[PDB]
Amino acid sequence: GVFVFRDETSSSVAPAKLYKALTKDSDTIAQKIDGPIQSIELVEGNGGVGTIKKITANEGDKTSFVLQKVDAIDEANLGYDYSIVGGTGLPESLEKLSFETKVVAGSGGGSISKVTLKFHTKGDAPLSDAVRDDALAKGAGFFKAIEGYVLANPAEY
Amino acid sequence: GVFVFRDETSSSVAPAKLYKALTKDSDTIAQKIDGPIQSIELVEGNGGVGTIKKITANEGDKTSFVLQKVDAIDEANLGYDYSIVGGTGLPESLEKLSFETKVVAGSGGGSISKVTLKFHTKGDAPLSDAVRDDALAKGAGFFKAIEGYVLANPAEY
């Protein structure tokens, strides 16, 4: 079935800048950002709509990956949509996990990174709270990692 | 005055592991990973209640520091309380910022990190959402960083 959840995160980083970091530079940041995400492979595409990325992450002695698909892009409105369609890193209980992201201006100088996750479980399979949360927590780690870089490199933003 | 905000963050890391990384290994971790914290100096104590640390961070090009004080520790219940009691890194509108944390076990095997921030102010002037949100984001950022560490370095936990 399908489950929809929304998540927000405030930031002192200006909208256009955070958006750029999150959707245009994040790929080229693997090297300069500590996190389980080891490498990001552009299987097919250069980043535009239709691009397929293989995202590898190492959790110690082990490793896994997810295959990402860039679904839609709207720079003007700071919009970015993609989804995980498979990969050893996608819980067995899920068929797919879509992300609809947008970055809006905050009320006091920064921005808000807004996300809407659409979980697709297998058939009538219910959605585990663990599975749901493991998903939200991973996106958050990623985000914090990108922001951290932006905040430490004003020269670049 | 005093303003209170509570929050709960779910994690896949087991409680004891998380508790240890956040309250025992954070100084070491903070200075190792790619992060704003440049150095941590002990001005008093070595970790026990009453301990005070001169934490020096860097966000952009501006350097700043805060004096952190250990207020209470209850390992029996994975509780840890500290507060920022001074320093240029503390917003001019705040007199002190205290944290009351606790890590509890989750139903799916993971854990839940509960945090309550208490913003202490000069007089009765209201707390700007800006100072409120940056303090929360920095707290959440630190959390995600420590957590990221634990996932990629199991040998220690």
Side-chain angles (χ1 to χ4, degrees), chain B residues 89-106 108-109:
Chain B
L90 182 69
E92 281 121 0
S93 59
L94 308 184
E95 175 59 43
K96 171 183 70 174
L97 170 60
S98 305
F99 299 74
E100 296 178 2
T101 74
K102 186 179 297 295
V103 180
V104 295

Side-chain angles (χ1 to χ4, degrees), chain B residues 1-5 7-58 60 63-106 108-121 123-157:
Chain B
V2 179
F3 304 70
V4 200
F5 304 93
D7 193 15
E8 294 191 41
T9 299
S10 175
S11 165
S12 64
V13 174
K17 292 175 185 180
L18 195 59
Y19 184 69
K20 175 175 175 298
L22 285 47
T23 71
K24 298 178 177 296
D25 308 339
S26 58
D27 293 352
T28 301
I29 296 172
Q31 296 172 279
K32 290 172 61 176
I33 62 178
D34 307 310
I37 294 182
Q38 302 305 293
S39 69
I40 297 185
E41 300 169 58
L42 286 169
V43 187
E44 167 180 3
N46 55 49
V49 178
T51 290
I52 289 177
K53 318 172 176 179
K54 173 186 176 189
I55 298 187
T56 303
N58 183 173
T63 295
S64 68
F65 78 94
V66 293
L67 281 176
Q68 199 183 77
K69 176 177 184 186
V70 179
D71 303 314
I73 307 179
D74 180 1
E75 297 222 12
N77 296 291
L78 312 195
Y80 189 66
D81 303 336
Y82 58 101
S83 57
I84 299 159
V85 298
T88 52
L90 182 69
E92 281 121 0
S93 59
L94 308 184
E95 175 59 43
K96 171 183 70 174
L97 170 60
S98 305
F99 299 74
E100 296 178 2
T101 74
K102 186 179 297 295
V103 180
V104 295
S111 64
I112 301 166
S113 174
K114 292 174 169 188
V115 182
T116 288
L117 286 68
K118 288 189 184 178
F119 298 68
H120 278 76
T121 62
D124 299 304
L127 176 79
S128 64
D129 290 358
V131 174
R132 187 199 61 189
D133 294 340
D134 294 328
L136 287 163
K138 288 174 178 57
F142 176 78
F143 177 83
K144 280 294 172 183
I146 298 296
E147 188 199 17
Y149 186 78
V150 172
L151 289 166
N153 302 286
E156 314 166 69
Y157 312 83

Side-chain angles (χ1 to χ4, degrees), chain A residues 106 108-113 115-121 123 125-126:
Chain A
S111 60
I112 301 171
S113 175
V115 186
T116 290
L117 296 75
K118 303 165 58 182
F119 292 78
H120 292 63
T121 53

